[PDB]
Amino acid sequence: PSHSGAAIFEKVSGIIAINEDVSPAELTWRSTDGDKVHTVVLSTIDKLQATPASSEKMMLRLIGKVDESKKRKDNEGNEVVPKPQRHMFSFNNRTVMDNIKMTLQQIISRYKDAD
């Protein structure tokens, strides 16, 4: 279960799954309740940031590039004004965050192959 692991998003915890069967791939997030499901685009991730090993708080932040006038906006608080969107996640498990972090990094490398 390296591609899928529990992760928090917006003070809410749920299971995070990595969907690569599509194109571009996407990271799915299902709440613990299973009533709310969030999907993230891995193609719009210029990079992947994570908390240091010296921080008891496990959180992985993803940079949603800067310019996205051509890319469809999430519509969830995004305005016409071009601005960089970042998604900060909170992990309740070091091993779980490490399983996703390393897995998410692989996807990046895959995007580089394209160009």
UniProtKB/Swiss-Prot annotation:
Region named Disordered: 65-85
UniProt biased composition (Basic and acidic residues): 65-76
Cellular localization per UniProt: Nucleus
Domain of life per record: Eukaryota
Family (UniProt): Belongs to the TFB1 family.
Known function: Component of the general transcription and DNA repair factor IIH (TFIIH) core complex, which is involved in general and transcription-coupled nucleotide excision repair (NER) of damaged DNA and, when complexed to TFIIK, in RNA transcription by RNA polymerase II. In NER, TFIIH acts by opening DNA around the lesion to allow the excision of the damaged oligonucleotide and its replacement by a new DNA fragment. In transcription, TFIIH has an essential role in transcription initiation.
Misc note: Present with 5150 molecules/cell in log phase SD medium.
Assembly behavior: Component of the 7-subunit TFIIH core complex composed of XPB/SSL2, XPD/RAD3, SSL1, TFB1, TFB2, TFB4 and TFB5, which is active in NER. The core complex associates with the 3-subunit CTD-kinase module TFIIK composed of CCL1, KIN28 and TFB3 to form the 10-subunit holoenzyme (holo-TFIIH) active in transcription. An additionnal subunit, TFB6, plays a role in the dissociation of the SSL2 helicase from TFIIH after transcription initiation. TFB1 interacts with XPC/RAD4. XPC/RAD4 recruits TFIIH to the NER machinery. Interacts with the NER 3'-endonuclease XPG/RAD2.
Record protein name field: General transcription and DNA repair factor IIH subunit TFB1
Taxonomic source organism: Saccharomyces cerevisiae (strain ATCC 204508 / S288c)
Entire-sequence positions represented here: 1 to 115 of 642
